[PDB]
Amino acid sequence: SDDELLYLPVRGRETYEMLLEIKESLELMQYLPQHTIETYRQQQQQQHQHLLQKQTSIQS
Amino acid sequence: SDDELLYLPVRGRETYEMLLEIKESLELMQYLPQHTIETYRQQQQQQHQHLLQKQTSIQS
Amino acid sequence: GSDEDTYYLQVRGRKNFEILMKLKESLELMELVPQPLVDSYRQQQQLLQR
Amino acid sequence: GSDEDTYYLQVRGRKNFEILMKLKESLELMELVPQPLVDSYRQQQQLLQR
């Protein structure tokens, strides 16, 4: 099945914390509606083409 | 316990593969006698300091 | 927000770059976006643990 | 001993760098070193399962 509930039997303290956190951050990122992320990645992309300098005024 | 057998329940085809391949590569690198990695890391670290072109001849 | 320094990586890995980019961006976003859905799912799913 | 191109990334995350560096290295080295302990351990670990 697609939804095959698999398990990952591991024993490492540092390993657990890193494996769980990176697993969680990615899973949550793809679960929650990436509204902020979409707009952020898209604007950062569009900024590259404007970085040549084309606006009358820009500020950060 | 430091050896706590922790089970990570997950269901994802690319998620299982990617997490396992990296997990295994990492675990094996920290488990097996990685003497080549030790000497490799050292050799590259030493080479960078000699990169100031101080040898008589250099070849690859 | 942070220092004035940046870490640079120069390596050629097709799989590695795809993987490291998604995991890299994932944590950067995880640090910038709050954790509501994280704790919400964590507990809702904790009901599956005993 | 690959293509002449390379991937270049610029980001500042402390835990992220420690992790990304060893994970990158993990695959790079696992790809350059053979897999003797891997095969030996893979089957020896499978014997813990049924």
Swiss-Prot record, chains A, B:
Annotated function: Acts as a sequence specific DNA binding transcriptional activator or repressor. The isoforms contain a varying set of transactivation and auto-regulating transactivation inhibiting domains thus showing an isoform specific activity. Isoform 2 activates RIPK4 transcription. May be required in conjunction with TP73/p73 for initiation of p53/TP53 dependent apoptosis in response to genotoxic insults and the presence of activated oncogenes. Involved in Notch signaling by probably inducing JAG1 and JAG2. Plays a role in the regulation of epithelial morphogenesis.
The organism's taxonomic lineage, starting at the top: Eukaryota, Metazoa, Chordata, Craniata, Vertebrata
Region annotation Oligomerization: where it falls in the sequence: 2-48
Feature: compositional bias, Low complexity: 42-55
Tissues in which the UniProt entry reports expression: Widely expressed, notably in heart, kidney, placenta, prostate, skeletal muscle, testis and thymus, although the precise isoform varies according to tissue type. Progenitor cell layers of skin, breast, eye and prostate express high levels of DeltaN-type isoforms. Isoform 10 is predominantly expressed in skin squamous cell carcinomas, but not in normal skin tissues.
Protein name: Tumor protein 63
Disease cited in the entry: Acro-dermato-ungual-lacrimal-tooth syndrome: A form of ectodermal dysplasia. Ectodermal dysplasia defines a heterogeneous group of disorders due to abnormal development of two or more ectodermal structures. ADULT syndrome involves ectrodactyly, syndactyly, finger- and toenail dysplasia, hypoplastic breasts and nipples, intensive freckling, lacrimal duct atresia, frontal alopecia, primary hypodontia and loss of permanent teeth. ADULT syndrome differs significantly from EEC3 syndrome by the absence of facial clefting. Inheritance is autosomal dominant. Ankyloblepharon-ectodermal defects-cleft lip/palate: An autosomal dominant condition characterized by congenital ectodermal dysplasia with coarse, wiry, sparse hair, dystrophic nails, slight hypohidrosis, scalp infections, ankyloblepharon filiform adnatum, maxillary hypoplasia, hypodontia and cleft lip/palate.
Domain comment (free text): The transactivation inhibitory domain (TID) can interact with, and inhibit the activity of the N-terminal transcriptional activation domain of TA*-type isoforms.
Family: Belongs to the p53 family.
Source organism of the structure: Homo sapiens (Human)
Full-length numbering of the shown residues: 397 to 455 of 680
Gene: TP63
Localization per Swiss-Prot or TrEMBL: Nucleus
Oligomeric form and interacting partners: Binds DNA as a homotetramer. Isoform composition of the tetramer may determine transactivation activity. Isoforms Alpha and Gamma interact with HIPK2. Interacts with SSRP1, leading to stimulate coactivator activity. Isoform 1 and isoform 2 interact with WWP1. Interacts with PDS5A. Isoform 5 (via activation domain) interacts with NOC2L.
PTM description: May be sumoylated.
From Swiss-Prot, chains C, D:
Protein task: Participates in the apoptotic response to DNA damage. Isoforms containing the transactivation domain are pro-apoptotic, isoforms lacking the domain are anti-apoptotic and block the function of p53 and transactivating p73 isoforms. May be a tumor suppressor protein. Is an activator of FOXJ1 expression. It is an essential factor for the positive regulation of lung ciliated cell differentiation.
Family listed: Belongs to the p53 family.
Note: Maps to a chromosome region frequently mutated in diverse cell lines of human cancer. Appears not to be frequently mutated in human cancers, in contrast to p53/TP53. Hemizygosity is observed in neuroblastoma and oligodendroglioma. Activated and stabilized by interaction with RANBP9.
Domain notes: Possesses an acidic transactivation domain, a central DNA binding domain and a C-terminal oligomerization domain that binds to the ABL1 tyrosine kinase SH3 domain. The PPxY motif mediates interaction with WWOX.
Subcellular location: Nucleus; Cytoplasm
Expression (tissue specificity): Expressed in striatal neurons of patients with Huntington disease (at protein level). Brain, kidney, placenta, colon, heart, liver, spleen, skeletal muscle, prostate, thymus and pancreas. Highly expressed in fetal tissue. Expressed in the respiratory epithelium.
Region Interaction with HIPK2, annotated ranges: 3-32
Cystine bridges: none
Post-translational modification: Phosphorylation by PLK1 and PLK3 inhibits the transcription regulator activity and pro-apoptotic function.
Complex formation: Found in a complex with p53/TP53 and CABLES1. The C-terminal oligomerization domain binds to the ABL1 tyrosine kinase SH3 domain. Interacts with HECW2. Isoform Beta interacts homotypically and with p53/TP53, whereas isoform Alpha does not. Isoform Gamma interacts homotypically and with all p73 isoforms. Isoform Delta interacts with isoform Gamma, isoform Alpha, and homotypically. Isoforms Alpha and Beta interact with HIPK2. Isoform Alpha interacts with RANBP9. Isoform Beta interacts with WWOX. Interacts (via SAM domain) with FBXO45 (via B30.2/SPRY domain).
UniProt induction comment: Not induced by DNA damage. Isoforms lacking the transactivation domain block gene induction.
Region feature (Oligomerization): 3-38
Taxonomy of the source species: Eukaryota, Metazoa, Chordata, Craniata, Vertebrata
Protein name, as recorded: Tumor protein p73
